[PDB]
Design a binder for these strands. Structure first.
Ligand SMILES: [Mg+2]
Ligand SMILES: [Mg+2]
Length: 172
RNA sequence: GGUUGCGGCCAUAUCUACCAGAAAGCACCGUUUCCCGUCCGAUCAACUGUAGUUAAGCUGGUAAGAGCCUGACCGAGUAGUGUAGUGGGUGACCAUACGCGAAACUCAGGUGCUGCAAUCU
């Protein structure tokens, strides 16, 4: 899984004599590949409608590419997750160039700060904030100030050799 | 279509309350010599369909009826459960993956169908 990928997954109940041409439900799924995306689709349709993989059918799966992969966006993400003692909703903000890597950042963030495994997370929503001043988290808001520039003090250079003859510097 | 005799399934047929029922049938209904049974022709027996009555039985209809029956992407793919992991959690327990999948509930509809023989504006 070099990264996540976003798939649109469209499926339906199996057609019957009573109801030919059912309703065609669709979701956007962040998954490492096609098989997981289809599995996640059925898992989530399990919780919304009376249907399972055996009574249903996957009409379409299509990868969804970022419209502008090279534009930095501020994403607001609503997640539902299970902690060890209950279920909680939260909203986080991630700044990056694509939805898939923003969601990838989000899973890493949920694992790091809340020990929430991919098993225990529901991506309720991902949406770009098209306007500044609608951004609310200070950790992403600090990066939107005009003419932003910071140094990177204490540069640590990687040495290929085991022994150095120079007693190095961390300048930058 | 009504009714009677014998039924099949055994409430969609049961229960409550209340209204209808032409004809025929069924019924209630008249009598106690006889065969029989009673504390008691109430029941059971016999006899006349004669004296009468649809009052009841019976049948059908009504009920935002009770019950019952059928369905529902109703609740609910919930509860539960087969399988898996060197999954989570101190534990109690829980999540996930591949499968199966209820009951209550909530609406909706319905309230006997039918076989054989005989008979009837
Ligand atoms: Mg008498
Ligand atoms: Mg094992």
């Amino acid at each position: 899984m070099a990264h996540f990928k976003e798939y649109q997954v469209i499926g339906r109940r199996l057609p019957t004599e009573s109801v030919p041409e059912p309703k065609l439900f669709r979701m956007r799924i962040f998954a490492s590949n096609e098989v997981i995306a289809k599995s996640r689709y059925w898992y989530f349709l399990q919780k919304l409608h009376k249907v399972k993989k055996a009574s249903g059918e996957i009409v379409s799966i299509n990868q969804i590419n970022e419209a502008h992969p090279t534009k930095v966006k501020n994403f607001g993400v609503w997640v539902r997750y299970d902690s060890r003692s209950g279920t909680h909703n939260m909203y986080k903000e991630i700044r990056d160039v694509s939805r898939v890597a923003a969601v990838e950042t989000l899973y890493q963030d949920m694992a790091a700060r809340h020990r929430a495994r991919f098993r225990s997370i529901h991506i309720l929503k991902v949406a770009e904030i098209e306007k500044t001043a609608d951004v609310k988290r200070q950790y992403v808001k600090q990066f939107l100030t005009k003419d932003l520039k910071f140094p990177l003090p204490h540069r640590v250079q990687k040495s290929t050799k085991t022994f150095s003859y120079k007693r190095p510097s961390t300048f930058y």
